[PDB]
Design a protein around this ligand. Sequence first.
Ligand SMILES: *C(=C)C1=C(C)[C@@H](Cc2[nH]c(/C=C3N=C(/C=C4\NC(=O)[C@H](C)[C@H]4[C@@H](*)C)C(C)=C\3CCC(=O)O)c(CCC(=O)O)c2C)NC1=O
Ligand SMILES: *C(C)[C@H]1/C(=C/C2=NC(=C\c3[nH]c(C[C@H]4NC(=O)C(C=C)=C4C)c(C)c3CCC(=O)O)/C(CCC(=O)O)=C2C)NC(=O)[C@@H]1C
Ligand SMILES: *[C@@H](C)[C@H]1/C(=C/C2=NC(=C\c3[nH]c(C[C@H]4NC(=O)C(C=C)=C4C)c(C)c3CCC(=O)O)/C(CCC(=O)O)=C2C)NC(=O)[C@@H]1C
Ligand SMILES: *[C@@H](C)[C@H]1/C(=C/C2=NC(=C\c3[nH]c(C[C@H]4NC(=O)C(C=C)=C4C)c(C)c3CCC(=O)O)/C(CCC(=O)O)=C2C)NC(=O)[C@@H]1C
Ligand SMILES: *[C@H](C)[C@H]1/C(=C/C2=NC(=C\c3[nH]c(C[C@H]4NC(=O)C(C=C)=C4C)c(C)c3CCC(=O)O)/C(CCC(=O)O)=C2C)NC(=O)[C@@H]1C
Ligand SMILES: *[C@H](C)[C@H]1/C(=C/C2=NC(=C\c3[nH]c(C[C@H]4NC(=O)C(C=C)=C4C)c(C)c3CCC(=O)O)/C(CCC(=O)O)=C2C)NC(=O)[C@@H]1C
Ligand SMILES: *[C@H](C)[C@H]1/C(=C/C2=NC(=C\c3[nH]c(C[C@H]4NC(=O)C(C=C)=C4C)c(C)c3CCC(=O)O)/C(CCC(=O)O)=C2C)NC(=O)[C@@H]1C
Ligand SMILES: *[C@H](C)[C@H]1/C(=C/C2=NC(=C\c3[nH]c(C[C@H]4NC(=O)C(C=C)=C4C)c(C)c3CCC(=O)O)/C(CCC(=O)O)=C2C)NC(=O)[C@@H]1C
Ligand SMILES: *[C@H](C)[C@H]1/C(=C/C2=NC(=C\c3[nH]c(C[C@H]4NC(=O)C(C=C)=C4C)c(C)c3CCC(=O)O)/C(CCC(=O)O)=C2C)NC(=O)[C@@H]1C
Ligand SMILES: *[C@H](C)[C@H]1/C(=C/C2=NC(=C\c3[nH]c(C[C@H]4NC(=O)C(C=C)=C4C)c(C)c3CCC(=O)O)/C(CCC(=O)O)=C2C)NC(=O)[C@@H]1C
Ligand SMILES: *[C@H](C)[C@H]1/C(=C/C2=NC(=C\c3[nH]c(C[C@H]4NC(=O)C(C=C)=C4C)c(C)c3CCC(=O)O)/C(CCC(=O)O)=C2C)NC(=O)[C@@H]1C
Ligand SMILES: *[C@H](C)[C@H]1/C(=C/C2=NC(=C\c3[nH]c(C[C@H]4NC(=O)C(C=C)=C4C)c(C)c3CCC(=O)O)/C(CCC(=O)O)=C2C)NC(=O)[C@@H]1C
Ligand SMILES: *[C@H](C)[C@H]1/C(=C/C2=NC(=C\c3[nH]c(C[C@H]4NC(=O)C(C=C)=C4C)c(C)c3CCC(=O)O)/C(CCC(=O)O)=C2C)NC(=O)[C@@H]1C
Ligand SMILES: C=CC1=C(C)[C@@H](Cc2[nH]c(/C=C3N=C(/C=C4\NC(=O)[C@H](C)[C@H]4CC)C(C)=C\3CCC(=O)O)c(CCC(=O)O)c2C)NC1=O
Lengths: 164, 164, 177, 177, 177, 146, 323
Amino acid sequence: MKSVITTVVSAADAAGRFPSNSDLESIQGNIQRSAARLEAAEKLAGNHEAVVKEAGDACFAKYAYLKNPGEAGENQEKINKCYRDVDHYMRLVNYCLVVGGTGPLDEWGIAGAREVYRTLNLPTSAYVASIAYTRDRLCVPRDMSAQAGVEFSAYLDYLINALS
Amino acid sequence: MKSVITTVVSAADAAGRFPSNSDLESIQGNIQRSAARLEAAEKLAGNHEAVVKEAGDACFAKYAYLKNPGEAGENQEKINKCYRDVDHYMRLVNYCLVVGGTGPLDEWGIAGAREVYRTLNLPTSAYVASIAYTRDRLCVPRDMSAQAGVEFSAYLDYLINALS
Amino acid sequence: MLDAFSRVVVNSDAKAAYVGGSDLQALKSFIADGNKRLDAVNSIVSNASCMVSDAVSGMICENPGLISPGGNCYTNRRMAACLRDGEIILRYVSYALLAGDASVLEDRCLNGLKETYIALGVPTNSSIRAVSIMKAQAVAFITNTATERKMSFAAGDCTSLASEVASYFDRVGAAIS
Amino acid sequence: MLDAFSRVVVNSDAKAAYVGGSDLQALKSFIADGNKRLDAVNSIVSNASCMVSDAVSGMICENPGLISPGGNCYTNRRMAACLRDGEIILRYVSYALLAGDASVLEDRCLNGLKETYIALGVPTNSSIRAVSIMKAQAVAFITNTATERKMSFAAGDCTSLASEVASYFDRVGAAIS
Amino acid sequence: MLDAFSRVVVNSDAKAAYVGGSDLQALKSFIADGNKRLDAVNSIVSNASCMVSDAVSGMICENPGLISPGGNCYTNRRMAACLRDGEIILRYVSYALLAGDASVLEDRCLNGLKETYIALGVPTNSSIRAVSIMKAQAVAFITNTATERKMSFAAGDCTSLASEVASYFDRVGAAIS
Amino acid sequence: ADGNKRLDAVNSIVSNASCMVSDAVSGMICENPGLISPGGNCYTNRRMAACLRDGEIILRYVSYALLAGDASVLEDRCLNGLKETYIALGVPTNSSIRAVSIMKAQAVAFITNTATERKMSFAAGDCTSLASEVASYFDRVGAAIS
Amino acid sequence: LTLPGTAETNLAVPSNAVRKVQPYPIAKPPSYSSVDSLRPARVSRMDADWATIYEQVRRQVMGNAYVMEGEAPDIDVAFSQLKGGNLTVREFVRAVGKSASYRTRFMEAKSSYNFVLLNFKHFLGRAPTQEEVSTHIQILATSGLEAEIDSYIDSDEYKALFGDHVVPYVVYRGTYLSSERFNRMVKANPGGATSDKAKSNLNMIATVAADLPTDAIDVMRGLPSPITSETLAFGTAYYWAKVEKEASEGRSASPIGEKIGKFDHAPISTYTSLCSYDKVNKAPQISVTNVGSDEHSYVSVTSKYIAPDMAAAAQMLADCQKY
Ligand SMILES: *C(=C)C1=C(C)[C@@H](Cc2[nH]c(/C=C3N=C(/C=C4\NC(=O)[C@H](C)[C@H]4[C@@H](*)C)C(C)=C\3CCC(=O)O)c(CCC(=O)O)c2C)NC1=O
Ligand SMILES: *C(C)[C@H]1/C(=C/C2=NC(=C\c3[nH]c(C[C@H]4NC(=O)C(C=C)=C4C)c(C)c3CCC(=O)O)/C(CCC(=O)O)=C2C)NC(=O)[C@@H]1C
Ligand SMILES: *[C@@H](C)[C@H]1/C(=C/C2=NC(=C\c3[nH]c(C[C@H]4NC(=O)C(C=C)=C4C)c(C)c3CCC(=O)O)/C(CCC(=O)O)=C2C)NC(=O)[C@@H]1C
Ligand SMILES: *[C@@H](C)[C@H]1/C(=C/C2=NC(=C\c3[nH]c(C[C@H]4NC(=O)C(C=C)=C4C)c(C)c3CCC(=O)O)/C(CCC(=O)O)=C2C)NC(=O)[C@@H]1C
Ligand SMILES: *[C@H](C)[C@H]1/C(=C/C2=NC(=C\c3[nH]c(C[C@H]4NC(=O)C(C=C)=C4C)c(C)c3CCC(=O)O)/C(CCC(=O)O)=C2C)NC(=O)[C@@H]1C
Ligand SMILES: *[C@H](C)[C@H]1/C(=C/C2=NC(=C\c3[nH]c(C[C@H]4NC(=O)C(C=C)=C4C)c(C)c3CCC(=O)O)/C(CCC(=O)O)=C2C)NC(=O)[C@@H]1C
Ligand SMILES: *[C@H](C)[C@H]1/C(=C/C2=NC(=C\c3[nH]c(C[C@H]4NC(=O)C(C=C)=C4C)c(C)c3CCC(=O)O)/C(CCC(=O)O)=C2C)NC(=O)[C@@H]1C
Ligand SMILES: *[C@H](C)[C@H]1/C(=C/C2=NC(=C\c3[nH]c(C[C@H]4NC(=O)C(C=C)=C4C)c(C)c3CCC(=O)O)/C(CCC(=O)O)=C2C)NC(=O)[C@@H]1C
Ligand SMILES: *[C@H](C)[C@H]1/C(=C/C2=NC(=C\c3[nH]c(C[C@H]4NC(=O)C(C=C)=C4C)c(C)c3CCC(=O)O)/C(CCC(=O)O)=C2C)NC(=O)[C@@H]1C
Ligand SMILES: *[C@H](C)[C@H]1/C(=C/C2=NC(=C\c3[nH]c(C[C@H]4NC(=O)C(C=C)=C4C)c(C)c3CCC(=O)O)/C(CCC(=O)O)=C2C)NC(=O)[C@@H]1C
Ligand SMILES: *[C@H](C)[C@H]1/C(=C/C2=NC(=C\c3[nH]c(C[C@H]4NC(=O)C(C=C)=C4C)c(C)c3CCC(=O)O)/C(CCC(=O)O)=C2C)NC(=O)[C@@H]1C
Ligand SMILES: *[C@H](C)[C@H]1/C(=C/C2=NC(=C\c3[nH]c(C[C@H]4NC(=O)C(C=C)=C4C)c(C)c3CCC(=O)O)/C(CCC(=O)O)=C2C)NC(=O)[C@@H]1C
Ligand SMILES: *[C@H](C)[C@H]1/C(=C/C2=NC(=C\c3[nH]c(C[C@H]4NC(=O)C(C=C)=C4C)c(C)c3CCC(=O)O)/C(CCC(=O)O)=C2C)NC(=O)[C@@H]1C
Ligand SMILES: C=CC1=C(C)[C@@H](Cc2[nH]c(/C=C3N=C(/C=C4\NC(=O)[C@H](C)[C@H]4CC)C(C)=C\3CCC(=O)O)c(CCC(=O)O)c2C)NC1=O
């Protein structure tokens, strides 16, 4: 959606012209990253339950005040709801490595977040705790290759920047 | 002007957002694709006075009605204007190959051209008979490389299709 | 709207899955031959203005009553309208051949094409015929079986991609009919 | 507007000169360490909201006369404009690092920023100090000299670009003074 | 567009009659209980942000298909757009409670709500559950029977106004069906 | 058995199926102009557009009958009661015989590549047993409406 | 960004290099218009505040977009310069129309005829004619997106109606240039909660603004008028025709049956050939490709394809005395 192939056929059609030679330089750039971020996509997809096994109770390990009543985490089922709230993000982080752009992360996770979390009383400082814990825990030779872990971590402070 | 560098920093300027992650991926195609077209310039700029003489006359070998009295090439100083009217086109194709796109060919050689040559009575078929003789004098083992020899041919047809 | 990359993540979003390594080698196959398709869209946009005028004048030369008075391509305003009633079809399948699926073609070029041609009086089988010619001229441009003009490629096969562009040229034929 | 590949042609159309192998070596040298430039923007826009909010906060802790009544960052609305006025010019610097020259930064942000800022009453001596910290933040990323965040790269140097963005964060100091 | 005073005089203009004595007698009773209406509007719009987040969350807990994929409040933008969607409704019911008849509600809020809910795909009977929670919250907030937050009025009877504000939530649920 | 010529001969009819109906209608006027006279059948804009529809249904049902190879679905969802309804609509049977006889004689030129204005660039051979099989379908639809 | 006093950009005529900004907003058109006395007032730059102005730009120029708090940052830039005096509200809707937020929900998600129909509704507050469509759709083929938006704002129709300081709105004039120009403006502009967003094609005004005939349906014109003009027409009398219309404007039914393309068929009992009416005029659509060894020669039985009733003339024209 906000991808590389969508932003060249929309720049072709905002000027009303054919596919030129300057958009065919761009799709050659898709060949040079889709051996890196495509096998970064499978590394998150197989290890998806074990990173929220890290980062899920690491979020409450920083702030443990909201395991109280009158708060945002009331009981175990809201904490079971909270692990679904973070697992939707690492779904969408996986989705924009297959796409390439910041397409699925904007209108499925980022747009309306300042609306929803303010009125439903959800703190954004605990949402940026879980992703920044997932950022620095990325070790380069243990997990994947090296450039697969660059645009992995470039999406992780993309949505921190959309919640700071 | 219509680069692969410009068309993504102007598409992101119109949305008011930062340089994205797939915005840094179309520049990665210029880490790949620029080395094919940068030696396309050096075969043109070292040989640009050859091809305007040996294929500027080929439209005159096509059209023998041009030197009649009452016509488009009347005297010698309109034929001297004609080998300048075709050296300006190869100078822009040389400017297109080192920019990346169809940047300089639009506003310096295509915009205005439907109004100028009809009002001054210059036949538009005599320009594209000159460009098609330059396009059908390419071969891989002599002239240039086989990947530069398809993309230098992918600018002369665009000058044909904007006039034919 | 959607390329071939985001089509497989819309289809993996309704079933709430990830995009794992089991259903990736339909798309990991496609960026193996990324350079195969990408020269093959330059084979369509090179002789693009040639193949429009051969399509529309060959439509005229089979039904020669459109140049008669009362015909839809009679007057000189309407022939210019018809000649970029077929250039929009060429541009909006060349977008879809670059992207991978016809999700930018069916919503902007084909969504409401039916009653636009019905109300204006544009005859139906002549406009099918003028894009049936554009079906046949495009698949010869990328199998290198255009009989007059040959283009220079790396010698191999492109029969995966002639069948891709043939399916776009009768999505238009099924939305007009 | 104009990038670094298009800066060399508008210096060479004025002679009607063909570009070639006496100034293509500076044009090949852009593509030589192009990935050093392309990691540079990954180390600016990623940690960008903490970068812009620190420089306006350190400008306040360096001059508490703007928080008084009559100050230019007094009420709650003026702080949100000061957070917004600072993150437009952070974007237009990175639109010039991605290009290679300040054609976008001069002609889409600075052409009129001086005459706007006179008519409002905003003090220019604090906007120099607010863009001074954003110069000093960006040189701690492309020489990796930051305290609380150490990002990993291919090791070596990017000491060319640490002066190059210090050619872009003081063109705004030239226009606003 | 019309208040409770001008609903009288459009009925007197249909007879070409003067507003005499027997039909002003229902209207002087509207003004004598005129501060009861004014405390009733104030007890709705004060705790209005908790009121509309509680209605759209009890709609989730009784029908939890909306947070599932394929739903309608699944996406974070779709939940934000639904939480504003049932916030225009409480703004226009409180205009009709202030004015005294459902005239402003019927044309600036309900005139085309069924058209934009078929085309966008919003479920009609799951919207019914959202406004019937707000019917129960509004008749508790103006009769002061709300358990978590207690207001402070004088003593008396505000049960004609609870039948009044239930009559306005019934028009939202009828025009949506 | 003869699979590749069968796909060639259906390709040479459904490509030019919009000339084949507009010439067979116009030839039916060309040797009886009483259809377009006041009182005739193909006189209005409403009734001409039904006749240009009817030649397309008959040509698309013998297009599939070559593709399957057998005349079985041609007679049981096109011709199982077409004779009884043209007499109930007043469609003249003398004029409809001269519309299936034109569309026979355009179809045998396209398969045998003897069309006098277009040479479709085929391979070489003899597509002549199939051309009497299309003619076998076309005599059957002519014998139905009579 | 430009300069803290500017009235017009881009220099299309020579008389904007000397033109001043208007000190006061322009007056209303001086014809009578009995419907405009039932309408809300003009939102202008002098009388309204910035909470009223940004709401009413979003209610007319943006349709009803439901713009969230973070999304459209480009319109927040162009609103930051509207409050600074750097551009007028005529130039503010020019920056809105050339933004990427206007593109992503009206250009690249709608159709091509449908994009031109929304631009008359958003920028001019009416509906075009077919001669006005075909001049604005040539700019989308030869000059792209930004030269099409620049032709509305720099037109003579804009500066007389709104000028520099009035937000666009539906103007009720009294005397119109045709009587069909009135009732297509009202049809294109209904009131609250309308939002041309998932109405993925219009399809009713997309075929009514394709003929200078076919005056459209009167229940799409009695609906969006102001009330006290349509009471005693909406108790339960024409009310049920409005119920059907709103269930068929939403979900976007195509008017090939009832409105354009109108073939009175034969009776059902007069044929009885292929039994039922459901499967009467069905004949198969066959398309082969013949490229190598990937074909999918798929025969599909297509639907009731009807007579063109426009391509059948030609018939009784190309062979009138001829043939
Ligand atoms: C007189 C007023 C008049 C006729 C008599 C009748 C002419 C007519 N033409 C044919 C034959 C063919 N029509 C064909 C169709 C086409 N030819 C093409 O090349 C394009 C693709 C297509 C659309 C126009 C073909 C292929 C033929 C056979 C070749 C040939 O011409 O012989 C017939 C049937 C044969 C016969 O004469 O018995 C008739 C009757 N139309 C008139 O206007
Ligand atoms: C390839 C198609 C053939 C082939 C053709 C020959 N070309 C000959 C001369 C020639 N060709 C060009 C065009 C070429 N030279 C350039 O410098 C540029 C770009 C700037 C291009 C496209 C020119 C200008 C000339 C004349 C001067 C020269 O020789 O370079 C040629 C010699 C005979 C002749 O001059 O006509 C031949 C045979 N050569 C091949 O080997 C393959 C088969
Ligand atoms: C099918 C239409 C053709 C055919 C196509 C093939 N092309 C193949 C490879 C290939 N294509 C390009 C084009 C690309 N280079 C440019 O400079 C530009 C524009 C600026 C473009 C769009 C390149 C570089 C390559 C080489 C890829 C590589 O190996 O590095 C190809 C090989 C398959 C593949 O590897 O992709 C085929 C089959 N060949 C044919 O015979 C038909 C007629
Ligand atoms: C915000 C907390 C307001 C407030 C609102 C009131 N809500 C009332 C009733 C009510 N609330 C819910 C939602 C709740 N129940 C659930 O089962 C779930 C989860 C699935 C949630 C979030 C429902 C379903 C209802 C019942 C509506 C009905 O009766 O049909 C209510 C009336 C009861 C009362 O409190 O007297 C009010 C006033 N309460 C407050 O004090 C703050 C200001
Ligand atoms: C790299 C700096 C060090 C190193 C660090 C350790 N990591 C340890 C455990 C661990 N880390 C992760 C996150 C990582 N695994 C993933 O699958 C993904 C995303 C796809 C990421 C970012 C996880 C899930 C775990 C738990 C066990 C596992 O599945 O690997 C670890 C053990 C103790 C600890 O947590 O501190 C260390 C020491 N280890 C190394 O070998 C290099 C030098
Ligand atoms: C998260 C905050 C950012 C980040 C920013 C960096 N700031 C850097 C230097 C710096 N910061 C301040 C403001 C600070 N000093 C104060 O005295 C007060 C309060 C009164 C505040 C808020 C100043 C004055 C400076 C020095 C600039 C100068 O004067 O030349 C900096 C570079 C060096 C450093 O790390 O300190 C960075 C990178 N750090 C992060 O990692 C995120 C992105
Ligand atoms: C913050 C670190 C600054 C500061 C900032 C303020 N800017 C204010 C208003 C304003 N700023 C601009 C320029 C901005 N808009 C653009 O479109 C572009 C470039 C493309 C830029 C740089 C404009 C046009 C405006 C007026 C429109 C508006 O925002 O209202 C502002 C508000 C002033 C007030 O009313 O109090 C502030 C506070 N001021 C400071 O003191 C530091 C240095
Ligand atoms: C029904 C919702 C309540 C209730 C209401 C009563 N209020 C009575 C008198 C009264 N109320 C207000 C508040 C209101 N008037 C305003 O002008 C404004 C704000 C602008 C508000 C919020 C006022 C000022 C008065 C003045 C008269 C007085 O009390 O001296 C009242 C007494 C009878 C009457 O005046 O009609 C009643 C019954 N009390 C209840 O028990 C329910 C829960
Ligand atoms: C034109 C070459 C003919 C002719 C045609 C007319 N046919 C009329 C009505 C009609 N025709 C059919 C048969 C056709 N429709 C089918 O569905 C199928 C098989 C699946 C076939 C072969 C039917 C069933 C009908 C009645 C249904 C309907 O009209 O919709 C017709 C009547 C138009 C009118 O009078 O309103 C005409 C003129 N008539 C001719 O004179 C030539 C020979
Ligand atoms: C709420 C919990 C519902 C639900 C609501 C949704 N409504 C959506 C969009 C929408 N709603 C309206 C009507 C509203 N806006 C107005 O301006 C007025 C009256 C003045 C009213 C009554 C409009 C006009 C729109 C579209 C505008 C826009 O695009 O912002 C909506 C968005 C659909 C989507 O994007 O997916 C939702 C989800 N849906 C539910 O499931 C519950 C029952
Ligand atoms: C030529 C192959 C046809 C034929 C074509 C005509 N089309 C006429 C008008 C027209 N066509 C379209 C659709 C097309 N134009 C677009 O801009 C887009 C996409 C955005 C598409 C798909 C539209 C929208 C229009 C109306 C506006 C316009 O003038 O472009 C037309 C003019 C009719 C007249 O007024 O006389 C003709 C003749 N007609 C034929 O007979 C052949 C088969
Ligand atoms: C008077 C002898 C009639 C009658 C007339 C009414 N006409 C009313 C409004 C109106 N009329 C038109 C059509 C007129 N304007 C045009 O531009 C053109 C053609 C170019 C024509 C013929 C329009 C468009 C409108 C409404 C728009 C507007 O007024 O701005 C009208 C007002 C209705 C009301 O508000 O009550 C009346 C009364 N009605 C009669 O009783 C007699 C028979
Ligand atoms: C008869 C109407 C034609 C004609 C046909 C012949 N084609 C022969 C071989 C052949 N035909 C095709 C095309 C066909 N095969 C397909 O899979 C499809 C897809 C729908 C089509 C249309 C192919 C690919 C081949 C094989 C390649 C080759 O030609 O060598 C053929 C040879 C005899 C046989 O093997 O059946 C004949 C006679 N030739 C004609 O003269 C008319 C025009
Ligand atoms: C009565 C008038 C009349 C015409 C105008 C032509 C029009 C025409 N051309 C082709 C067929 C074709 N047309 C082209 C197009 C072109 N060939 C080139 O070399 C150029 C690049 C470009 C024209 C500028 C191509 C490549 C083919 C495929 C076969 C061929 O090369 O001829 C076809 C057959 C398509 C089909 O039905 O399958 C037709 C009808 N024929 C006619 O009967």
